[PDB]
Structures are given as structure tokens and as C-alpha cells.
From a paper:
Here, we use single-molecule optical tweezers to study the folding of consensus-designed tetratricopeptide repeats (CTPRs), superhelical arrays of short helix-turn-helix motifs. The packing of the TPR motif results in superhelical structures, which means that, of all the different repeat-protein types, TPR arrays most closely resemble a physical spring. The starting point for this study was a consensus-designed TPR protein (referred to as CTPRa) that adopts a superhelical structure within the crystal lattice. This superhelical geometry of the TPRs is established through stacking of the A-helix (Ai+1 in Figure 1A) of a given repeat against both A- and B-helices of the preceding repeat (Ai and Bi in Figure 1A). The resulting angles between repeat planes then give rise to the pitch and diameter of the superhelix.
We used X-ray crystallography to determine the structure of a construct composed of 4 repeats of the new variant and a C-terminal solvating helix, CTPRrv4, to 3.0 Å resolution. As was observed for CTPRa, the C-terminal solvating helix was not resolved due to a higher preference for end-to-end stacking between molecules in neighboring asymmetric units. The resolution was sufficient to determine the change in repeat plane angles using the Cα coordinates: while the twist remained almost unchanged, an increase in the curvature is compensated by a similar decrease in bending. Although these changes may at first appear insignificant in the context of a 4-repeat array, they translate into clear differences in the longer superhelical arrays, leading to a decrease in helix length and increase in helix diameter. Circular dichroism spectroscopy of the 5-repeat proteins used in this study shows that the CTPR α-helicity remains intact in the new repeat type. Whereas CTPRa variants unfolded and refolded at a plateau force of ≈12.5 pN, the plateau of CRPRrv was significantly lower at ≈9.5 pN, indicating that the introduced mutations have a destabilizing effect.
Author numbering: 3 to 136
Write the structure that this text describes.
């Protein structure tokens, strides 16, 4: 399944999303509890705009590893892209509970608050993000 994963990665990198979904799904048939295949699938579904399928494989990935800040963040992103800001915040906060120094989670939390109109919170979360790396 590592070869199938690699094939999917290449097509995914070159934007051939439907070919990438094929190869990731083939990796899941060999190891149905493959974290990399499950995460990579949610990645392609998110990039495609299939937000229900992205949630499906992102929630499947969090079942096997509830400490994937990368998946926790991408689940929040998928919820933000479908306008569910309450769920998106909940997931960015889950990613910050795990790692309070997550620059993408802090940046994404400021982004959602800006979209919401809570600019006082947005400035607070954006400041936290720059307080890490210049």
C-alpha cells in the first residue's frame, strides 16, 4: 500500500484529483486503517470541494489518531468552507488544545473571527500567531 500511496501522491501533486482518489482508495483496500491514505483522501476531497466526503475521511482519520493537528486543522477548514463557523472554531480550538503553538490554527482562528466580525478576537489570535516566527 506504500507504492499505491506514492502513486496517489504524485497525481494529487499534479492536480489529477480523480486519479489520486483511485490510488488512495486502493491503499485503503489493503490497509483499511492506513492513516496516510485516509488523510490524503480527505485532502483530495477537500481540494475537490466534496466537503461531506472530506469530513467522512477526516473523521475516520481522527478515530485512529485523535492527535493529528494537521487533520484537526483541515477538518476546521472544511467546516469553514461550508460556512459552519461554530464547528470550524471548535475544531481549530481542538488543534490548539493539542498544540497551543500551532501557527496555522491560530491564523485560521483569527480568519474565522474576522469573517464573523469579532475583530477584537481576530487581533488576539493573529497576534499569537506572529508571536511565534518573524
Amino acid at each position: 500500500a506504500e507504492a499505491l500511496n506514492n502513486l496517489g501522491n504524485v497525481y494529487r501533486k499534479q492536480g489529477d484529483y480523480q486519479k489520486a482518489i483511485e490510488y488512495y482508495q486502493k491503499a485503503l483496500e489493503l490497509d483499511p486503517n492506513n492513516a496516510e491514505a485516509l488523510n490524503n483522501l480527505g485532502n483530495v476531497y477537500r481540494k475537490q470541494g466534496d466537503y461531506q466526503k472530506a469530513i467522512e475521511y477526516y473523521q475516520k482519520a481522527l478515530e485512529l489518531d485523535p492527535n493529528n493537528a494537521e487533520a484537526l486543522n483541515n477538518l476546521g477548514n472544511v467546516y469553514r468552507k461550508q460556512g459552519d463557523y461554530q464547528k470550524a472554531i471548535e475544531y481549530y480550538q481542538k488543534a490548539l488544545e493539542l498544540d497551543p503553538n500551532n501557527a496555522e490554527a491560530l491564523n485560521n482562528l483569527g480568519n474565522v473571527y474576522r469573517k464573523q466580525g469579532d475583530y477584537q478576537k481576530a487581533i488576539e489570535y493573529y497576534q499569537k500567531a506572529l508571536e511565534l516566527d518573524p
